Design a protein around this ligand. Structure first.
Ligand SMILES: N#Cc1cnc(-c2nc(CC(=O)N[C@H](C(=O)O)c3ccccc3)cs2)c(O)c1
Ligand SMILES: [Fe+2]
Length: 231
C-alpha cells in the first residue's frame, strides 16, 4: 500500500469523477498519523474556546429561523497549534492545482481559509442548502472529516447530497480521514442529517477567477488567499 501521487489522483480520479458526477470522495487522504494530529489540533481549538456559534454567522436577524447548530473558527494554517491543519490545506491545494483547467471551465485562482467546525450532536446539524446560490465566486467545496470510528446508523451526521437533475443522491458518512469534493453551486443542494455525537469537519472553498471578478460586492467567506506553495 503506497500513496497515490497527487497528479495521478487528480487526473485519473478527481477530474473524471467531478466532471461526471460533480461529487467526489477520497478516503485515507493523509493517513492515521496526520489525521489524528489534525483531530488533536481541532479538539484543542474547541477546548480552549476558540469557536463561535455558526448560527450567528449565517443568520440575518436575531429572530431568523435556525439554519445551523454548529461552532466554528477560521484557520489560516500558520497560527500556533494549527500546523497540521495547515498541512491539510497545502495538501488540498496541491490536488486542486493538478486539476486546474480540467474542472469544467473554471480557473481556480485561490481559496478561502479553513472553516473548522464542530457539531456537538444533540440533534444539531445543518438544514438543506446550496453553498453558493448567487455566484459568489466559490466553485468547489472541499471538506475533510476527522471522526474516528463513526457509526451513522446510531450517530447520524450523514451528509446527503442531491445532484440537481439526476436520478440519484449521495449519502456521505463523515468518515475519519475522508476528503470530499463537490460543486458549490445550485448543482449540489445538500443537508447535514441530525448528529448524536460530537462531529468535527474542516471546509475549504475554492474560487474561480472569472466568477469572482464578476461577483457582486454584496457577496472570510469572501476573502481569497493564494494556494499554499511547498515549503
Ligand atoms: N457534511 C457537511 C457539511 C455541509 N455543509 C456545510 C456548510 N455549508 C455552508 C453554506 C455556505 O456556503 N455559506 C455560508 C453563507 O453563505 O453565509 C457560510 C460560509 C462560511 C461561514 C459561515 C456561513 C457553510 S458550512 C458544512 O460545514 C458541512
Ligand atoms: Fe454546505
Amino acid at each position: 500500500t503506497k500513496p497515490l501521487p497527487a497528479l495521478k489522483l487528480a487526473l485519473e480520479y478527481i477530474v473524471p469523477c467531478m466532471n461526471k458526477h460533480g461529487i467526489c470522495v477520497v478516503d485515507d487522504f493523509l493517513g492515521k498519523e496526520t489525521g489524528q494530529q489534525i483531530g488533536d489540533e481541532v479538539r484543542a481549538l474547541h477546548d480552549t474556546g476558540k469557536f463561535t456559534d455558526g448560527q450567528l454567522v449565517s443568520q440575518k436577524s436575531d429572530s431568523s429561523k435556525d439554519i445551523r447548530g454548529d461552532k466554528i473558527t477560521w484557520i489560516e494554517g500558520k497560527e500556533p497549534g494549527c500546523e497540521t491543519i495547515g498541512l491539510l490545506m497545502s495538501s488540498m491545494d496541491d490536488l486542486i492545482r493538478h486539476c486546474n483547467g480540467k474542472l469544467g471551465s473554471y480557473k481556480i485562482n485561490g481559496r478561502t481559509k479553513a472553516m473548522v467546525a464542530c457539531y456537538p450532536g444533540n440533534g444539531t446539524g445543518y438544514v438543506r442548502h446550496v453553498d453558493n446560490p448567487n455566484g459568489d465566486g466559490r466553485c468547489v467545496t472541499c471538506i475533510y472529516y476527522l471522526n474516528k470510528d463513526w457509526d451513522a446508523k446510531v450517530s447520524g451526521g450523514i451528509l446527503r447530497i442531491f445532484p440537481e437533475g439526476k436520478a440519484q443522491f449521495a449519502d456521505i458518512e463523515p468518515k475519519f480521514d475522508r476528503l470530499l469534493f463537490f460543486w458549490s453551486d445550485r448543482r449540489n443542494p445538500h443537508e447535514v442529517q441530525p448528529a448524536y455525537a460530537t462531529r468535527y469537519a474542516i471546509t475549504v472553498w475554492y474560487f474561480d477567477a472569472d466568477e469572482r471578478a464578476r461577483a457582486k460586492v454584496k457577496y472570510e467567506k469572501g476573502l481569497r488567499v493564494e494556494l499554499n506553495k511547498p515549503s
